[PDB]
């Protein structure tokens, strides 16, 4: 069912919207996002060079939580740029069941470095 | 023992001259000590790195690490993600696999490992390569070639003096020449992670490469020794060590790197290599290619 969701989104004109539609249909979120072992005493910032989860987050390997990496399709970024690959993403534990969806739906505060609506300000 | 990241093959067992026997371990289901949302390979690599933290690894300011067999059925690279976590920030991490996958490495090369070429030397080589198509408990158990032949050549040609390696083996997945090459390090083992201790898997670890024999190892014999050890020393599964990550990152040693000629490598510098306070390699721009 992972093979299917990835292909479902990879062959959509708007992969992010496709993932949303797929989820709303009752489809299972993308699996095998790589959760790291960590102290839960990090800064809690959204995207970091090493795991920075606080007590209310999980840290995941970045590339595994990126829809575009996982689907093997172009990133929406102007040039060839992914902001997750090579880094770690902190995901609220309540949302840890769907890290790819979390990163798609949310935005990092340009001042806090924390997820807008989940720890920012 | 339960608190350790795993168990290393004792000297007493390395020193034997055992005949090769069948391994009496089997590995049921399902990874009883892996924490609920964690991948076995994340736990396994974490304990490997924890164990490497106990050794005299050289860690240069601009460290170079290459990771073979980094892919998986999952399409992701859990081991790579752990190595990226463990290694100093800015460390060059290149990974590779026969099959396509997505990873956190700086560069990723897809293809058979034999297609991977580089003129540059490396500070640490990690291999988790394993052939899914070799038979489990069968007829005979001869030394395996394939990727193992490549690794032996890569180690001899592309590992910096002072550098280290960790290469995954099992009862059936092993190579005699690789064991022999272990004798060309300052120290070697023999390491079984506590989280996977029901398996005949181990990591052959060579610490501080010397580029010449230090001891004479016979591979067939040493693997028989390894199997005898596993057969006679059951190890209880444990994930104890996973619950304290406060000291995980590889220590920033600022290990000197120098390009030295053979005639400059005297007893004094061998002692630095063994300690391991020195890496010997060039510092040219790193180019790794997969062709063709
Ligand atoms: C046990 S999996 C490794 C899992 C991975 N290390 C992780 O972190 O989850 C073994 C891997 O070795 C790879 N492999 C086997 N033979 C190879 C070869 N000759 N060249 C490159 N990769 C090879 C397989 O494709 C497979 O992905
Ligand atoms: Zn990406
Ligand atoms: Zn903010």
Numbering used by the authors:
A (entry chain B): 9 to 129
B (entry chain A): 3 to 294
Kindly provide excerpts from the paper associated with this entry.
Recently, it was shown that SARS-CoV nsp16 acts as 2′-O-MTase in complex with nsp10 and selectively 2′-O-methylates the cap-0 structure to give rise to cap-1 structure. SARS-CoV nsp16 requires nsp10 as a stimulatory factor to execute its 2′-O-MTase activity and this also holds true for other coronaviruses (our unpublished results). Here we report the crystal structure of the heterodimer of nsp16 and nsp10 (nsp16/nsp10) with bound methyl donor SAM and biochemical characterization of the stimulation mechanisms. We found that nsp10 is required for nsp16 to bind both SAM and RNA substrate, and the crystal structure shows that nsp10 may stabilize the SAM-binding pocket and extend the RNA-binding groove of nsp16.
Within one asymmetric unit in the crystals, one nsp10, one nsp16 and one SAM molecule were identified unambiguously. The structure of nsp16 exhibits the characteristic fold of the class I MTase family, comprising a seven-stranded β-sheet surrounded by α-helices and loops. Two zinc ions were clearly identified in nsp10, which formed the center of two zinc fingers, one coordinated by Cys-74, Cys-77, His-83 and Cys-90, and the other coordinated by Cys-117, Cys-120, Cys-128 and Cys-130. Nsp10 and nsp16 formed a protein complex through an interaction surface covering approximately 1767 Å2 in total, indicating a very stable interaction. Intermolecular hydrogen bonds exist between Gly-70/Ala-71/Gly-94 of nsp10 and Asp-106 of nsp16, Lys-93 of nsp10 and Ser-105 of nsp16, Leu-45 of nsp10 and Gln-87 of nsp16, Tyr-96 of nsp10 and Ala-83/Gln-87 of nsp16. The adenosine moiety of SAM is stacked among Phe-149, Met-131 and Cys-115 in nsp16 through Van der Waals force, and polar contacts also exist, such as those of adenine N6 with side chain of Asp-114, N1 with main chain of Cys-115, and N3 with main chain of Leu-100. The crystal structure of nsp16/nsp10 complex shows that the SAM binding cleft of nsp16 is composed of three loops: loop 71–79 (residues 71–79) together with loop 100–108 (residues 100–108) forming a wall on one side of the cleft and loop 130–148 (residues 130–148), which is followed by αD helix, forming a wall on the other side. In the crystal structure of nsp16/nsp10 complex, one hydrogen bond forms between Lys-93 of nsp10 and Ser-105 of nsp16, and two salt bridges exist between His-80 ND1 and NE2 from nsp10 with Asp-102 OD2 from nsp16. Both Ser-105 and Asp-102 of nsp16 are located in the flexible loop region 100–108, which stabilizes one wall of the SAM binding cleft, and consequently promotes the SAM binding activity of nsp16/nsp10 complex. In the crystal structure, the SAM methyl group stretches out to the surface provided by the K-D-K-E motif, which are located at the bottom of the central groove, and might bind the first adenine nucleotide, conserved in SARS genomic and subgenomic RNAs, as the acceptor of methyl group during the methylation.
